Motif scaffolding. Structure first.
Motif, PDB file in Angstrom:
ATOM      1  N   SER D  12       0.823  -1.203   0.000  1.00  0.00           N
ATOM      2  CA  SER D  12       0.000   0.000   0.000  1.00  0.00           C
ATOM      3  C   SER D  12       0.859   1.256   0.000  1.00  0.00           C
ATOM      4  O   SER D  12       0.452   2.283  -0.556  1.00  0.00           O
ATOM      5  CB  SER D  12      -0.941  -0.005   1.202  1.00  0.00           C
ATOM      6  N   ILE D  42      -8.630 -17.226  12.369  1.00  0.00           N
ATOM      7  CA  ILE D  42      -9.177 -18.398  11.695  1.00  0.00           C
ATOM      8  C   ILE D  42      -8.845 -19.672  12.461  1.00  0.00           C
ATOM      9  O   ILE D  42      -9.748 -20.383  12.918  1.00  0.00           O
ATOM     10  CB  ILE D  42      -8.679 -18.467  10.240  1.00  0.00           C
ATOM     11  N   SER D  49     -10.772 -33.366  18.048  1.00  0.00           N
ATOM     12  CA  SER D  49     -11.551 -33.428  19.278  1.00  0.00           C
ATOM     13  C   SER D  49     -12.469 -34.637  19.212  1.00  0.00           C
ATOM     14  O   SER D  49     -12.894 -35.037  18.130  1.00  0.00           O
ATOM     15  CB  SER D  49     -12.383 -32.160  19.491  1.00  0.00           C
ATOM     16  N   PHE D  51     -14.658 -35.480  22.469  1.00  0.00           N
ATOM     17  CA  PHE D  51     -15.674 -35.447  23.517  1.00  0.00           C
ATOM     18  C   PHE D  51     -15.674 -36.756  24.309  1.00  0.00           C
ATOM     19  O   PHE D  51     -16.658 -37.490  24.355  1.00  0.00           O
ATOM     20  CB  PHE D  51     -17.057 -35.179  22.915  1.00  0.00           C
ATOM     21  N   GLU D 199     -15.269 -36.372  11.089  1.00  0.00           N
ATOM     22  CA  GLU D 199     -15.911 -36.970  12.242  1.00  0.00           C
ATOM     23  C   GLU D 199     -15.761 -38.474  12.112  1.00  0.00           C
ATOM     24  O   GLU D 199     -16.159 -39.054  11.098  1.00  0.00           O
ATOM     25  CB  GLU D 199     -17.381 -36.563  12.327  1.00  0.00           C
ATOM     26  N   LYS D 222     -13.337 -35.883  16.159  1.00  0.00           N
ATOM     27  CA  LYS D 222     -13.655 -34.903  15.121  1.00  0.00           C
ATOM     28  C   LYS D 222     -12.401 -34.145  14.700  1.00  0.00           C
ATOM     29  O   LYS D 222     -11.903 -33.261  15.397  1.00  0.00           O
ATOM     30  CB  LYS D 222     -14.732 -33.946  15.615  1.00  0.00           C
ATOM     31  N   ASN D 309       7.401   5.641 -36.355  1.00  0.00           N
ATOM     32  CA  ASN D 309       6.028   6.119 -36.323  1.00  0.00           C
ATOM     33  C   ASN D 309       5.877   7.378 -37.162  1.00  0.00           C
ATOM     34  O   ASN D 309       4.860   7.564 -37.838  1.00  0.00           O
ATOM     35  CB  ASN D 309       5.601   6.371 -34.880  1.00  0.00           C
ATOM     36  N   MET D 320      17.046  12.769 -43.583  1.00  0.00           N
ATOM     37  CA  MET D 320      16.765  14.092 -43.038  1.00  0.00           C
ATOM     38  C   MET D 320      16.228  13.992 -41.616  1.00  0.00           C
ATOM     39  O   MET D 320      16.628  14.760 -40.733  1.00  0.00           O
ATOM     40  CB  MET D 320      15.776  14.828 -43.940  1.00  0.00           C
ATOM     41  N   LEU D 323      19.107  13.150 -39.312  1.00  0.00           N
ATOM     42  CA  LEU D 323      19.909  14.338 -39.035  1.00  0.00           C
ATOM     43  C   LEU D 323      19.192  15.270 -38.070  1.00  0.00           C
ATOM     44  O   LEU D 323      19.819  15.863 -37.184  1.00  0.00           O
ATOM     45  CB  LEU D 323      20.238  15.060 -40.341  1.00  0.00           C
ATOM     46  N   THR D 324      17.874  15.405 -38.217  1.00  0.00           N
ATOM     47  CA  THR D 324      17.101  16.223 -37.295  1.00  0.00           C
ATOM     48  C   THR D 324      17.071  15.633 -35.897  1.00  0.00           C
ATOM     49  O   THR D 324      16.933  16.382 -34.924  1.00  0.00           O
ATOM     50  CB  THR D 324      15.669  16.393 -37.806  1.00  0.00           C
TER      51      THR D 324
ATOM     52  N   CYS F  22      -4.451   2.627  -2.732  1.00  0.00           N
ATOM     53  CA  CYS F  22      -4.010   2.619  -1.344  1.00  0.00           C
ATOM     54  C   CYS F  22      -5.190   2.476  -0.395  1.00  0.00           C
ATOM     55  O   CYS F  22      -5.174   1.638   0.512  1.00  0.00           O
ATOM     56  CB  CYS F  22      -3.228   3.897  -1.039  1.00  0.00           C
ATOM     57  N   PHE F  61     -15.219 -29.917  22.844  1.00  0.00           N
ATOM     58  CA  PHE F  61     -15.519 -30.736  21.677  1.00  0.00           C
ATOM     59  C   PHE F  61     -16.835 -30.321  21.051  1.00  0.00           C
ATOM     60  O   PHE F  61     -16.987 -30.360  19.829  1.00  0.00           O
ATOM     61  CB  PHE F  61     -15.554 -32.211  22.056  1.00  0.00           C
ATOM     62  N   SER F  64     -16.218 -27.170  19.075  1.00  0.00           N
ATOM     63  CA  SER F  64     -15.477 -27.506  17.871  1.00  0.00           C
ATOM     64  C   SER F  64     -16.372 -28.183  16.843  1.00  0.00           C
ATOM     65  O   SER F  64     -16.352 -27.821  15.664  1.00  0.00           O
ATOM     66  CB  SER F  64     -14.294 -28.402  18.220  1.00  0.00           C
ATOM     67  N   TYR F  65     -17.160 -29.166  17.270  1.00  0.00           N
ATOM     68  CA  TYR F  65     -17.965 -29.925  16.325  1.00  0.00           C
ATOM     69  C   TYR F  65     -19.000 -29.031  15.667  1.00  0.00           C
ATOM     70  O   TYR F  65     -19.246 -29.132  14.464  1.00  0.00           O
ATOM     71  CB  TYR F  65     -18.624 -31.104  17.031  1.00  0.00           C
ATOM     72  N   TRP F  67     -18.737 -25.658  15.340  1.00  0.00           N
ATOM     73  CA  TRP F  67     -17.989 -24.725  14.515  1.00  0.00           C
ATOM     74  C   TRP F  67     -17.579 -25.370  13.204  1.00  0.00           C
ATOM     75  O   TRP F  67     -17.458 -24.699  12.177  1.00  0.00           O
ATOM     76  CB  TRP F  67     -16.776 -24.237  15.294  1.00  0.00           C
ATOM     77  N   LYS F  89     -18.369 -17.754   8.690  1.00  0.00           N
ATOM     78  CA  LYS F  89     -17.153 -18.505   8.954  1.00  0.00           C
ATOM     79  C   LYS F  89     -15.947 -17.839   8.315  1.00  0.00           C
ATOM     80  O   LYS F  89     -14.907 -17.671   8.958  1.00  0.00           O
ATOM     81  CB  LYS F  89     -17.301 -19.940   8.452  1.00  0.00           C
ATOM     82  N   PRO F  92     -13.750 -13.010   7.344  1.00  0.00           N
ATOM     83  CA  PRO F  92     -12.372 -12.502   7.286  1.00  0.00           C
ATOM     84  C   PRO F  92     -11.606 -13.026   6.092  1.00  0.00           C
ATOM     85  O   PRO F  92     -10.931 -12.259   5.395  1.00  0.00           O
ATOM     86  CB  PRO F  92     -11.771 -12.992   8.608  1.00  0.00           C
ATOM     87  N   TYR F  93     -11.678 -14.333   5.850  1.00  0.00           N
ATOM     88  CA  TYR F  93     -11.001 -14.905   4.695  1.00  0.00           C
ATOM     89  C   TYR F  93     -11.512 -14.274   3.409  1.00  0.00           C
ATOM     90  O   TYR F  93     -10.741 -14.003   2.481  1.00  0.00           O
ATOM     91  CB  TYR F  93     -11.196 -16.419   4.677  1.00  0.00           C
ATOM     92  N   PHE F 145      17.349  20.334 -40.047  1.00  0.00           N
ATOM     93  CA  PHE F 145      16.469  19.646 -39.109  1.00  0.00           C
ATOM     94  C   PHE F 145      15.020  20.098 -39.279  1.00  0.00           C
ATOM     95  O   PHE F 145      14.373  19.766 -40.274  1.00  0.00           O
ATOM     96  CB  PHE F 145      16.931  19.885 -37.668  1.00  0.00           C
ATOM     97  N   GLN F 152       5.637  14.648 -33.372  1.00  0.00           N
ATOM     98  CA  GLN F 152       5.466  13.401 -34.103  1.00  0.00           C
ATOM     99  C   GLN F 152       5.174  12.248 -33.154  1.00  0.00           C
ATOM    100  O   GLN F 152       4.255  11.458 -33.394  1.00  0.00           O
ATOM    101  CB  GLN F 152       6.710  13.111 -34.940  1.00  0.00           C
ATOM    102  N   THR F 156       1.788  10.077 -32.867  1.00  0.00           N
ATOM    103  CA  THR F 156       1.891   8.626 -32.939  1.00  0.00           C
ATOM    104  C   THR F 156       1.105   7.967 -31.816  1.00  0.00           C
ATOM    105  O   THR F 156       0.248   7.113 -32.069  1.00  0.00           O
ATOM    106  CB  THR F 156       3.358   8.205 -32.873  1.00  0.00           C
TER     107      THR F 156
END
Ligand SMILES: CC1(C)[C@@H](OC(=O)CCC(=O)O)CC[C@]2(C)[C@H]3C(=O)C=C4[C@@H]5C[C@@](C)(C(=O)O)CC[C@]5(C)CC[C@@]4(C)[C@]3(C)CC[C@@H]12
Lengths: 325, 329, 329, 327, 328, 323
Positions: D12, D42, D49, D51, D199, D222, D309, D320, D323-324, F22, F61, F64-65, F67, F89, F92-93, F145, F152, F156
């Motif tokens: 950034s 995340i 797990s 339980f 699971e 799990k 171009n 010419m 030369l220019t 930015c 558990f 977790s399960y 989620w 879920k 953010p990703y 010249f 030019q 172009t």
């Protein structure tokens, strides 16, 4: 493992073969070890045994720690395969780190060695080829209108000395021994039954020898042994592939080819003698580095162009050579 | 260990100090620090110094108090009952700290050298290099004039350094104190390995103050000094490193036995340089300066041309000043 | 530390101050600083510095409250009942902070010096350097003309400095205040070490407020000031370092004896240079300026040439003006 | 994350560009994905797990979670419908991702080490010859206003013979495309996993835990974040399915080469009006590619472009106009 | 604390400000900042700032809620039952924040003197410096020609500055603001230390909301401001440092008294310079201008040369024109 | 937010496209980091109230399960549907991916545009400065010249549109991403914010016929509100930023205040600006006028133009005075 990500990002935005070998033999184990203790995957300390629920929280911690320390004391250990498996399990990363540092050593020995005479003589032979080219160009230019085989004599002198060739071959051979030992060891650390982790311990010593609330013994398992197994397998593959590369690098005369002086042999201002082949001498290593860094000489490119022209055969050496300038 | 990872990653993609000595300092200073860091790895060193397997009836914070009280009581030798003695426990609590102390002690000689001993030898090397370059240039100009002052000033400074011993004494002193430290730490560590590994599973009973007459307290706790085997294996590795580095340190110490080819012989083919190397066999800055010449001679390209001339004369093809004219340095 | 040692490892791979005093500042700052760092090392610092072994009936957060209240009670002297007294509690409750304050106090004098008197010394050094270089140039030109003003300017500056002690007063004052600091800190650290080593295992009873007539509270808890052992070991280490450092400070104080081998005679081989060094026993800015000139005399190339010439004249191989022209400076 | 945050903040705040971008994506997408796989927000915690019963102690349950999580290596032990292979894949999904990523990143390094120096030197030489030729032509035109051998063209015809560098570049691109193919196959495979293995039943009943009685038979274990792995792997698979045709088009050497710059030097009387550089699996083609690539680095190339171009408008005479220019 | 540790370790590895004032600002900045950083030291900081030993019947999270509730209740003055009052607790909470405010206030006047009174200072410095250099060069060339315009320019600038009292006022103002700041801050510091140190322990009763008529709640909890003694010790150290620094501030205020060692008098031996020291203590910006002239006059080589010649003339053995010619 | 705060503090003590890039890069990154902050992240992503009888690790558990069950559509019981759970879920990703996608076109374009733009600018600057020095020499000779080369090159570029096409493509893909992510952000906010209060029933495998387990727990998706507020902020930011890219799109219309006119008053320069009204690299290169400040000679030409604006003095006279 965000530091390796940043290393790649700054990546995003000595013989080359040896450089690549150093790169592989360095990153693969180092990146592996970093991956093993990677924070996301470094969850768990490999002491789990589920002492009886009667055992208090800290009592359980003491069990885990006492077993983890008892991995060393063979008499405290009750194992099927033996303690040396457990030892290997504990120090597996440390062992990997030591192996990797050992492998990085020979390149560092060369770097601080710097092949002093070799690099200075590389600069020297560069200047000599450049001066020979300039002299041939001026000679042809005057024709359109000292004299000692300096580089050739230096080459003849290298034809006797193999000290630097001995250094190169020793570095490569130490590298090969390192990788061979590490590969044998890594397969061994993969030669595990993979059942050794789930071993039984009993910390019934000291006042705990005749303690009663203690269970007879605890079955702890060394976690991530599967992870260590997988990483050892990866590294073993990498090194079983790398070893042929070290082997091919070991055969330097078999590698020294494509005579660069062959184009400069067309020079009158240069001795007409390639005289660079078939030797276990620093002649070969110097020739190899000459082929390596030979593009750096503009006159080398010009000589290749003139050699192609002679292969084209449209012009002769003197006319097209003087035209080159 | 992200530090070593980044070090290797950047590793992936005047000297005024001996390469052998520089590498010896590097190894003998890092390997102890390296091992210390590798052990101080929280992934490797997760738990506390020692657990105690207190009674389950003891509260969790009570268990913590027991653990901490014993771990601190390792200092009070009367506090615990151990057959090996207090010095084992002391070593265990201070193993990393003592390692760090030895490492700092090893870093001291190179630091002091760079601060005091180095700069004077650096200025001396600069003067010798300027003298050598000027002498090569003057001899080359004489050879050119033939192809078309006069005081051995550098030889004079060399004869003077042949009397001068102070700097050689300083270098030998740094190397010798270094070797002494290596030997002392090696003995210490090997003894730290000599530890039977039984002190860890010691017993403590914190029955001080009102806890002297406390009732709910058990008789004592069985505490086990964790990372004792870890510290021992690290001690073994460090002792290996030092028993291997010591011979290198000793050979570094031998200055007369350095047995280096006379760099002056390359300038000895100069007409403008009198034919006298005479730089060996003296417990003086003579041999040390000769070693530094053998070291930093690559920094002088004129030394390279002299070496090329030396190789050519080894071929025996041509004559010396004619070849110098052919060089046109 | 981990990252501190990492940065230290990656560190490997005009003086304007007294090099000895520079190294003294370095040691006297690093020993306490590195020590304090160790006091916050994860492997060393195992956790809180207090533990109290409350009754198991006391709840977990209750135990935390007890620990904290006793910890704060180390200040309240009427609350904690210790056979040694409260002053030990003060000490080994702020021992790290005290060390840090002492270290800052020790870094203060060199800072005041570098800020106040250092530029004066730098100007004086540059001026004397220009004067010496000009004298060398004029002498070389005159010798060459022989081969074909004149006022004691540096000698005048020397005579002038021989009167004033102001800058010498500043330097000696910095050094002396530093030495007083060292002595005070040494006494303090030895005192803190010279502790029962048992007072830490004190007893507290937080029965204040409603807890005064409360019932569930034990009469008192046997609480322990943890890490006192490691604090003591660190204090002993620092005290030893300072007992080793103080004589160096004293030697720094003795400036005349520190003043040795005046290089003014290495220019006295010049006719355009005064034959009177007049550079000894000067209890004034003379001595300090002369010492700093001795320090930085290597930086001047003409000093190197004059040293070579002085060695030759000691070797007796060349006449002074002849060899001067031959060097061709 | 944080290192990613600093990289984006500074964001950034000689090698084929298409290939550069290809390597860049093929590196960052998996690298960024892997970094997210350990994102504090995340990544919520352990990956497994089950339980265990409340009767099992806290640390006991910890041991259960751990021994089960490790039991994924124990093929016969675990109880899953899919087999040890899917649970294995999940056990080291980020490891496989990193292996693939480093594998893809290697060929660019091998290139930037092996084919880089020769091509760099040759390009510097060709550009230098071009500059000298432009200088000579402008000087001759200036003198008229008051050797002669196709040297660079000779080097071009020479490169037209050798294809070693062309072979190296083509092999680099080809191995890279092969890596993309295998990796995308693997990634789709991992995502193809039915999200059932996550699971499953774990029974750490070995040894004294085999004949232990206070332990239940097993737990319902799990694997965690498998859905996260699925989503990110799908993203990466899409990225690589988009990237593979780019690698293919990159591998198209005669087709990627267009608008021969030699026409700009073909405006020269002193330099042959002949491109004669196209349509070949020779290092000539790649050299032409890099010539088109870094021809903007040559100022005289810009002069030739403007002059050409202008001559397209037909305004002034070529001598010419030269030369220019007075370049 | 390893950040500042490595900072001071690598510490071991024009002026546009008065050295005395520089040291004053440095100390007045570091001491409070160092203390604050010490307060959040993990070894030093033991943990949470309040503890109250709720009944064991109160659950773990219940206990945490009690602790936090009282901790915030230090603000609600009625909820806290304090014999000393709430303002002590108020001071306790923001004590670091109070120190940080005092520190920023201490750093401000240095900044004002940094950017403000940078232009006039640097301008006068460079100008008078070039003027002295030119006067020396002219006197030397004059002696060389004699052995072989005429305007008191810098003297005129000094006469002009004699009327000037702008930068003098600004310097006095920067010093005065600083003195007031440190004075008030030290008063505050003692006042904080003045506290009983037993006020740290206070009772809280969280009976608000449904806790007004809650039953499982006790009447109250007795909570303690943890690490208050540490803040006390820090206030003690800072108060000592500032009682030491304030007289230094006063000495810095006395600009004319401090103005000494006339350097223009050393330039008063110049031919191209009129015999006029023009160095009189007054409410004039010259005095500070004279002060910084004394400060950075060492940066003038010709100043050293003139000092040498001045010692020579004190020797009384060399003629001023003859020695001037000798100066080369 | 200590790192960003320190970065702005040390900060404290096409340009329009640059600023748009930015902002559109930082605002999402800044917001995602803000949520990433543990000061903002006061708890785990879902804390969801298992029964007290369930053990601490049992509750773990459960959380977790569930989620994980935010993906398994059969597993969770929600009225709004699974896609809400999905969005919550990986919100953010999703933000991170959108930000990377938005940062890509700057990199790609600048890469493509760097050589071409810099070289054309250097050449045009050289030509303009040369014509200026030549007119100055002619005026000085008059005091004592003939090819429109830059004209030019300009005519172009007035033919070729490929580079202008590249600029328009960068801006257009940019606006496309902006619109897509803005609609997406409003949508994620459009969520009734009730889905968080869904129930999960982990009765899979042995938990199907397990009895000690309750039928289900009503679990809560935490930080839904924070993410929603973030979405609102970012969406407003983008609704403000997009019309900037819109104005950027009408770049030929956006081309104003022809800088060539100040160079048009030279004798050594023909009196012809001829730069407007085109879908060609002409106006792009003119957007020249951006970094046109680097030419001191351009400053002199503007000064001469301003002098003639009052009409006080003759152009060549004051020009020779400038020299
Ligand atoms: C905070 C963490 C998770 C942990 O902190 C960490 O390790 C880092 C992670 C984190 O901070 O969350 C330290 C342990 C601990 C402080 C832990 C503890 O001490 C003892 C118990 C007891 C275990 C138990 C069920 C029994 O064992 O029988 C008896 C009941 C009781 C009170 C339930 C709650 C926990 C588990 C308690 C208080 C919950 C919070 C917990």
């Amino acid at each position: 493992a965000i530091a390796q990500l940043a290393t790649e990002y700054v990546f995003s935005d000595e013989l080359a073969v040896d450089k690549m070998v150093t790169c592989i033999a360095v990153g693969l184990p180092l990146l592996l070890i970093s991956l093993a203790f990677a924070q996301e995957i470094s969850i768990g300390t490999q002491i789990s045994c589920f002492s009886p629920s009667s055992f208090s929280w800290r009592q359980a911690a003491f069990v885990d720690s006492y077993c983890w320390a008892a991995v060393q004391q063979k008499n405290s250990l009750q194992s099927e395969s033996g303690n040396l498996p457990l030892w290997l399990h504990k120090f597996f990363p440390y062992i990997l780190l030591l192996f990797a540092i050992l492998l990085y050593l020979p390149p560092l020995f060369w770097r601080f060695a710097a092949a002093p005479h070799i690099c200075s003589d590389l600069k020297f032979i560069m200047e000599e080829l450049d001066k020979v080219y300039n002299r041939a160009i001026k000679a042809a230019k005057s024709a359109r209108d000292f004299k000692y085989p300096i580089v050739e004599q230096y080459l003849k002198t290298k034809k006797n000395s193999n000290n630097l060739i001995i250094k190169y071959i020793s570095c490569r051979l130490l590298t090969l021994i390192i990788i061979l030992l590490a590969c044998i060891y890594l397969g061994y650390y993969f030669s595990l039954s993979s059942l050794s982790d789930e071993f039984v311990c009993s910390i019934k010593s000291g006042i705990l020898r005749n303690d009663s609330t203690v269970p007879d013994q605890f079955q702890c398992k060394l976690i991530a042994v599967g992870i260590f197994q997988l990483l050892s397998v990866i590294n073993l593959v990498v090194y079983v592939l790398l070893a042929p590369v070290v082997v091919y690098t070991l055969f330097v005369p078999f590698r020294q080819k494509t005579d660069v002086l062959k184009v400069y042999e067309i020079l009158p201002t240069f001795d007409v003698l390639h005289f660079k082949s078939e030797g276990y001498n620093d002649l070969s290593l110097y020739n190899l580095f000459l082929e390596e860094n030979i593009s750096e000489v503009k006159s080398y490119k010009c000589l290749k162009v003139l050699e192609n022209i002679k292969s084209s055969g449209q012009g002769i050496d003197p006319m097209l050579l003087l035209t080159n300038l």
